[PDB]
Amino acid sequence: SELLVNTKSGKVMGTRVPVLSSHISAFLGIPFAEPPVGNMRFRRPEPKKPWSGVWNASTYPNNCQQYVDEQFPGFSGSEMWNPNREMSEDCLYLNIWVPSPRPKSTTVMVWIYGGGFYSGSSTLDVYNGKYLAYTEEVVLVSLSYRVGAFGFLALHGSQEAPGNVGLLDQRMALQWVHDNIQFFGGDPKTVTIFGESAGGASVGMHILSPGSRDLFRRAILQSGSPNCPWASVSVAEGRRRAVELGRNLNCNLNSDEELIHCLREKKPQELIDVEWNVLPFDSIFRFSFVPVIDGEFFPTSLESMLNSGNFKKTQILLGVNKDEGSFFLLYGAPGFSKDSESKISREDFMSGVKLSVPHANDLGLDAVTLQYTDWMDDNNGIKNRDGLDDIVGDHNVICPLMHFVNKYTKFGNGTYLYFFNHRASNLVWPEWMGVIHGYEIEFVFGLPLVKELNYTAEEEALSRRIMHYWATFAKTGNPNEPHSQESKWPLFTTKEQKFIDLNTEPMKVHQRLRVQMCVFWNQFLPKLLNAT
Amino acid sequence: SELLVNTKSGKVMGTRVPVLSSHISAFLGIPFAEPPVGNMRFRRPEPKKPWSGVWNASTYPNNCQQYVDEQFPGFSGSEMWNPNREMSEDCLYLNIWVPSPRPKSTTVMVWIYGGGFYSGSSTLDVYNGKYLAYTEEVVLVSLSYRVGAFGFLALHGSQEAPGNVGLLDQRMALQWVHDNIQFFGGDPKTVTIFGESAGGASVGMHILSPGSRDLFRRAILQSGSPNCPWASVSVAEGRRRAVELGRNLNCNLNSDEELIHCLREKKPQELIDVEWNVLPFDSIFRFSFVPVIDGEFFPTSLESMLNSGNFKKTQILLGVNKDEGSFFLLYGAPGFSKDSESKISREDFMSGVKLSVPHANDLGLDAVTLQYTDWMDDNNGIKNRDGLDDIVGDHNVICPLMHFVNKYTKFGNGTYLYFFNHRASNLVWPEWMGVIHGYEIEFVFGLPLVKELNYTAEEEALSRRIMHYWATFAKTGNPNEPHSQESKWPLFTTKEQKFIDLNTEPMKVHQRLRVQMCVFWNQFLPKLLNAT
Ligand SMILES: *[C@@H]1O[C@H](CO)[C@@H](O[C@@H]2O[C@H](CO)[C@@H](O)[C@H](O)[C@H]2NC(C)=O)[C@H](O)[C@H]1NC(C)=O
Ligand SMILES: *[C@@H]1O[C@H](CO[C@@H]2O[C@@H](C)[C@@H](O)[C@@H](O)[C@@H]2O)[C@@H](O)[C@H](O)[C@H]1NC(C)=O
Ligand SMILES: *[P@](C)(=O)O[C@H](C)C(C)(C)C
Ligand SMILES: *[P@](C)(=O)O[C@H](C)C(C)(C)C
Ligand SMILES: [Cl-]
Ligand SMILES: [Cl-]
């Protein structure tokens, strides 16, 4: 039986799923760790104990416990990111889509969801692996990992809540893929990890962490990089926020043991309800429980690792969307709303700048304002709105990614950079938001191939082009088909810094992505802040 | 006799001078102060004692003792600025051009030469007042004043070398004009002071100083403003440089009395030979002996005077040239030379930035570099050369002037702003230097009306247009002829910030002159430097 697979953990039975007038096999909700429940809350994951009989892998698993977005009830633009299954702390499962007939030793791609480390689900419609697995003939895996305090509460020095456990959940799923994917017809020596936003940061973190490097071959990072300002905190800051969470829940704070015990007694929703209260600043694009620079998962600072070439040397493919900032401004900044053009007054610009760079002193804020204000036309509401989008996008996504790409490329074995700038014809969000954080994912996963979803012909073609770049890259370390006539995606090099756009128009090659602003964010501002 | 005038100081006999197929009267070398020689060196000027008989005013006076430019011997571009008469400490004289027949009560314009406070002469060919006096029917006066240490050595607290004596020379010439110009047919109630570079700064300083305000009606400032970073120093810095001059000349430094006595024994050239050695920094566009913020000539800081409206409220006309920086880069910065295109390497750019902003710390230098580097094309030699021109021009001339105009306009009675951007057809300097510091002067003084000087027809027309703006402004407080059909030079207002270009093409109105860079120079950089 094509739907029966024996693994080192036991037998699993999958399900035949229709896809684009054909079918493939899906193995959904396979456990890769023991349920991290009770006294196991906050602890490193434990390998799943093997089972007897046949694991029923016909249905999606529970999602991890998380904050749920209720800002626009019933609206598909926001609800498409929310858990679509029951939430449980029992949530460490993976999903595999397998071509039919079962392959022998094919390329494997492992998806790591984003959600700012506070949310996310492997089960979202937009992460349905069937289209990519079917079209490009890969074994497509999606893993899961604990988010929020359950994944990232960090009391450094404690073994009960050491931090980074969600990253260790991801590593354990990669370990399981390494050990077992061959039985599904996957080649464990040709595994590509790929992820978006926090999943992109996570991919970079596995590139860096000595304990993860050997578990995959190559990597794709979408709108995320390990050095993003929101993606990690120090052990002191992690400790502070954990104690502040305890304070919110009226915990005994006299020791780590007392705090952890109190926190373990709470219902999951109790933690989630006060999660946002522990942030040190009035901010946007900052999240409470995130990876911690611990000296173990990350042996030294991210900057010193990148500078010294202390990371996995392989090929990477990565890039960003045109309007990375707009999502967070909409949700978090005055003057921005879903149902208006959100033209921004000078005053709301200033408020926005302060929220966007919460760690800056007044001089730093002046620097940012000067860098992004057109002083020939400073009361232009469109320019102010677009300026803020750029500030938030450049600071949180594009410039950290550019800093990563330039550091990585000095030691790596091949870099391909993209700029995704296609606004989908059927987008439900307002026009002012442009090409939003997260909205390339639907193209990467082939949703535009589905008739009922109402994409244009050109959008289907774009999706096929992207799926083929991603999968060819996963296969070979190069997104370009050898000896094809199509226009080539050039290698990013330190010298020429080339990248391509990704849209429905003929591909163009560009150079030096947002270089002017990234010198400001990567070189000048940090120096200014360190001096003053 | 038209050439004989009786004044309160005694009788003067002038000379009939040919001008443009006609003639006018010139009274050259009239004394307005006692010779500031011997024990009077460094002291405030004394009014000239009246004389018996007839003062022979047929020939140009001596020029004040100054550093003489020998960088390009025999080259007209540089030598046109050098003294063209014998140098003497006996140099406090003025020149008057008077229409023929002698007017009754006509508009008076008083020219104050530039030269960075270290040089300058009233007698330069380029300051020949005959063309303007003849064409526009004004009484044209040019004054003189002590420059270098002779005018500006400052030992605050001493009455023997108090500082600012060159500004007091200028005021005494204005006093003489006030008291005597009526006899030459001038109206002492309608005197316009005008000057370029240090003369423009000087004009602004008379606007500010309570002791000067009553001596003139209105004012024109060309490429200079009183708040320019090179135009004044503190009393502490003036003292330091005076003592350092003494050190260079092996003076007794035990007291002001000992230092001044030593300095008074020296031949003028002895002072001049070591003048440049007292500067505190490795710099360009900085001069050794300049006006001092003394609490007397200037009652408080220039910034507090400007902020509180502590200045003469009247009409002003002022502006700048396109390439204010190039002169000083040519003379003072590596990579720049007279006979090459002076394309600038990244390395010479950095050296240039450091020389241009000598008071900045390393962070400030980084700020300037970031503000003026095109990071998409950073090795472009033309862009680097042009970037440096802008840095030097914006920092030293344009941005201080813009700061002055905006402060002044809040309290004043009418502001007219220009941007002179015509490159003269017969310019002897290289093309890379563009529209140079000082090169509007020839247009203001009507040299393009002289056939033998080889200007184009369009340049003559531009000169006539400029002379007419300047003189109509001097007459009425408005450069525009009432009820003429020509296009109007609009008033500069706080709200609309309009200015005109001045070139051979039809006049255009623009707004917000170099506003982006001037926020950097006037607001951000000073804040950065004060914090770090
Ligand atoms: C990626 O690594 C491979 C293998 O280390 C590089 O290929 C080698 O390149 C050197 C220098 O040209 C050759 O002498 C070897 O013969 C190559 N080996 C093989 C197996 O081809 C390759 O250049 C690297 N690619 C990038 C883009 O850095
Ligand atoms: C495997 O599971 C299939 C779908 O199961 C459904 O979800 C689980 C969690 C239960 O709630 C179950 O009642 C639901 O039907 C079944 O259709 C299928 O029969 C199962 N196969 C075997 C061999 O057990
Ligand atoms: P990143 C901040 O993890 O973003 C998530 C995936 C999204 C829902 C797209 C905003
Ligand atoms: P400013 C620095 O006084 O400039 C003088 C007049 C010139 C000779 C034009 C450079
Ligand atoms: Cl947009
Ligand atoms: Cl030029």
PDB file of N, CA and C in Angstrom, chain A residues 448-481:
ATOM      1  N   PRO A 448      -2.249  30.006  -6.899  1.00  0.00           N
ATOM      2  CA  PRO A 448      -2.753  30.533  -8.184  1.00  0.00           C
ATOM      3  C   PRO A 448      -3.003  29.504  -9.296  1.00  0.00           C
ATOM      4  N   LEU A 449      -2.674  28.238  -9.039  1.00  0.00           N
ATOM      5  CA  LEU A 449      -2.978  27.169  -9.980  1.00  0.00           C
ATOM      6  C   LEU A 449      -4.380  26.650  -9.774  1.00  0.00           C
ATOM      7  N   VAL A 450      -4.999  27.020  -8.651  1.00  0.00           N
ATOM      8  CA  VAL A 450      -6.345  26.584  -8.322  1.00  0.00           C
ATOM      9  C   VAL A 450      -7.390  27.540  -8.927  1.00  0.00           C
ATOM     10  N   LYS A 451      -8.138  27.016  -9.895  1.00  0.00           N
ATOM     11  CA  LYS A 451      -9.182  27.749 -10.628  1.00  0.00           C
ATOM     12  C   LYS A 451     -10.115  28.575  -9.726  1.00  0.00           C
ATOM     13  N   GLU A 452     -10.696  27.924  -8.722  1.00  0.00           N
ATOM     14  CA  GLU A 452     -11.680  28.537  -7.823  1.00  0.00           C
ATOM     15  C   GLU A 452     -11.166  29.726  -7.005  1.00  0.00           C
ATOM     16  N   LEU A 453      -9.853  29.941  -6.979  1.00  0.00           N
ATOM     17  CA  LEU A 453      -9.296  31.029  -6.176  1.00  0.00           C
ATOM     18  C   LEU A 453      -9.184  32.360  -6.924  1.00  0.00           C
ATOM     19  N   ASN A 454      -9.497  32.347  -8.221  1.00  0.00           N
ATOM     20  CA  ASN A 454      -9.695  33.583  -9.007  1.00  0.00           C
ATOM     21  C   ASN A 454      -8.448  34.423  -9.233  1.00  0.00           C
ATOM     22  N   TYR A 455      -7.298  33.775  -9.417  1.00  0.00           N
ATOM     23  CA  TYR A 455      -6.090  34.501  -9.804  1.00  0.00           C
ATOM     24  C   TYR A 455      -6.111  34.645 -11.320  1.00  0.00           C
ATOM     25  N   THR A 456      -5.309  35.547 -11.867  1.00  0.00           N
ATOM     26  CA  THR A 456      -5.225  35.680 -13.315  1.00  0.00           C
ATOM     27  C   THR A 456      -4.314  34.600 -13.921  1.00  0.00           C
ATOM     28  N   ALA A 457      -4.379  34.453 -15.244  1.00  0.00           N
ATOM     29  CA  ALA A 457      -3.464  33.576 -15.975  1.00  0.00           C
ATOM     30  C   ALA A 457      -1.999  33.938 -15.718  1.00  0.00           C
ATOM     31  N   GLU A 458      -1.694  35.230 -15.699  1.00  0.00           N
ATOM     32  CA  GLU A 458      -0.318  35.700 -15.505  1.00  0.00           C
ATOM     33  C   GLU A 458       0.169  35.354 -14.095  1.00  0.00           C
ATOM     34  N   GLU A 459      -0.755  35.350 -13.141  1.00  0.00           N
ATOM     35  CA  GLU A 459      -0.421  35.010 -11.759  1.00  0.00           C
ATOM     36  C   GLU A 459      -0.130  33.525 -11.589  1.00  0.00           C
ATOM     37  N   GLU A 460      -0.901  32.674 -12.278  1.00  0.00           N
ATOM     38  CA  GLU A 460      -0.589  31.240 -12.334  1.00  0.00           C
ATOM     39  C   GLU A 460       0.825  31.035 -12.874  1.00  0.00           C
ATOM     40  N   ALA A 461       1.148  31.736 -13.964  1.00  0.00           N
ATOM     41  CA  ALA A 461       2.462  31.640 -14.588  1.00  0.00           C
ATOM     42  C   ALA A 461       3.563  32.083 -13.632  1.00  0.00           C
ATOM     43  N   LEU A 462       3.334  33.195 -12.931  1.00  0.00           N
ATOM     44  CA  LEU A 462       4.286  33.650 -11.913  1.00  0.00           C
ATOM     45  C   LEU A 462       4.506  32.598 -10.817  1.00  0.00           C
ATOM     46  N   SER A 463       3.423  32.013 -10.343  1.00  0.00           N
ATOM     47  CA  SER A 463       3.482  30.971  -9.319  1.00  0.00           C
ATOM     48  C   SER A 463       4.292  29.757  -9.804  1.00  0.00           C
ATOM     49  N   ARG A 464       4.009  29.309 -11.027  1.00  0.00           N
ATOM     50  CA  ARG A 464       4.757  28.180 -11.617  1.00  0.00           C
ATOM     51  C   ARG A 464       6.239  28.497 -11.731  1.00  0.00           C
ATOM     52  N   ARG A 465       6.545  29.721 -12.130  1.00  0.00           N
ATOM     53  CA  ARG A 465       7.923  30.192 -12.227  1.00  0.00           C
ATOM     54  C   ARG A 465       8.621  30.153 -10.849  1.00  0.00           C
ATOM     55  N   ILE A 466       7.916  30.623  -9.818  1.00  0.00           N
ATOM     56  CA  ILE A 466       8.470  30.683  -8.457  1.00  0.00           C
ATOM     57  C   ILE A 466       8.658  29.280  -7.885  1.00  0.00           C
ATOM     58  N   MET A 467       7.614  28.457  -7.956  1.00  0.00           N
ATOM     59  CA  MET A 467       7.695  27.064  -7.500  1.00  0.00           C
ATOM     60  C   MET A 467       8.878  26.343  -8.158  1.00  0.00           C
ATOM     61  N   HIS A 468       9.091  26.623  -9.444  1.00  0.00           N
ATOM     62  CA  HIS A 468      10.179  25.992 -10.183  1.00  0.00           C
ATOM     63  C   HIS A 468      11.557  26.508  -9.787  1.00  0.00           C
ATOM     64  N   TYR A 469      11.687  27.819  -9.557  1.00  0.00           N
ATOM     65  CA  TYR A 469      12.927  28.353  -8.983  1.00  0.00           C
ATOM     66  C   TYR A 469      13.242  27.704  -7.630  1.00  0.00           C
ATOM     67  N   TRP A 470      12.254  27.712  -6.731  1.00  0.00           N
ATOM     68  CA  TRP A 470      12.438  27.216  -5.364  1.00  0.00           C
ATOM     69  C   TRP A 470      12.834  25.720  -5.372  1.00  0.00           C
ATOM     70  N   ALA A 471      12.059  24.903  -6.093  1.00  0.00           N
ATOM     71  CA  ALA A 471      12.320  23.459  -6.188  1.00  0.00           C
ATOM     72  C   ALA A 471      13.609  23.103  -6.929  1.00  0.00           C
ATOM     73  N   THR A 472      13.937  23.834  -7.995  1.00  0.00           N
ATOM     74  CA  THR A 472      15.186  23.593  -8.735  1.00  0.00           C
ATOM     75  C   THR A 472      16.362  23.969  -7.846  1.00  0.00           C
ATOM     76  N   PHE A 473      16.221  25.091  -7.139  1.00  0.00           N
ATOM     77  CA  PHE A 473      17.199  25.436  -6.126  1.00  0.00           C
ATOM     78  C   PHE A 473      17.342  24.338  -5.069  1.00  0.00           C
ATOM     79  N   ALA A 474      16.230  23.825  -4.556  1.00  0.00           N
ATOM     80  CA  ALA A 474      16.299  22.777  -3.538  1.00  0.00           C
ATOM     81  C   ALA A 474      17.058  21.551  -4.084  1.00  0.00           C
ATOM     82  N   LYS A 475      16.815  21.246  -5.359  1.00  0.00           N
ATOM     83  CA  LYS A 475      17.407  20.076  -6.018  1.00  0.00           C
ATOM     84  C   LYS A 475      18.917  20.211  -6.255  1.00  0.00           C
ATOM     85  N   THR A 476      19.358  21.399  -6.661  1.00  0.00           N
ATOM     86  CA  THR A 476      20.677  21.550  -7.264  1.00  0.00           C
ATOM     87  C   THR A 476      21.557  22.621  -6.642  1.00  0.00           C
ATOM     88  N   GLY A 477      20.969  23.510  -5.834  1.00  0.00           N
ATOM     89  CA  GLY A 477      21.725  24.648  -5.307  1.00  0.00           C
ATOM     90  C   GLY A 477      21.721  25.841  -6.246  1.00  0.00           C
ATOM     91  N   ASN A 478      20.917  25.747  -7.297  1.00  0.00           N
ATOM     92  CA  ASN A 478      20.824  26.777  -8.335  1.00  0.00           C
ATOM     93  C   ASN A 478      19.379  26.795  -8.839  1.00  0.00           C
ATOM     94  N   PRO A 479      18.679  27.957  -8.779  1.00  0.00           N
ATOM     95  CA  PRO A 479      17.258  28.014  -9.212  1.00  0.00           C
ATOM     96  C   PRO A 479      17.061  27.900 -10.735  1.00  0.00           C
ATOM     97  N   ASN A 480      18.149  28.075 -11.483  1.00  0.00           N
ATOM     98  CA  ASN A 480      18.135  28.020 -12.947  1.00  0.00           C
ATOM     99  C   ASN A 480      18.267  26.589 -13.465  1.00  0.00           C
ATOM    100  N   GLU A 481      17.374  26.212 -14.376  1.00  0.00           N
ATOM    101  CA  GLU A 481      17.506  24.975 -15.157  1.00  0.00           C
ATOM    102  C   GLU A 481      18.747  25.036 -16.032  1.00  0.00           C
TER     103      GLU A 481
END
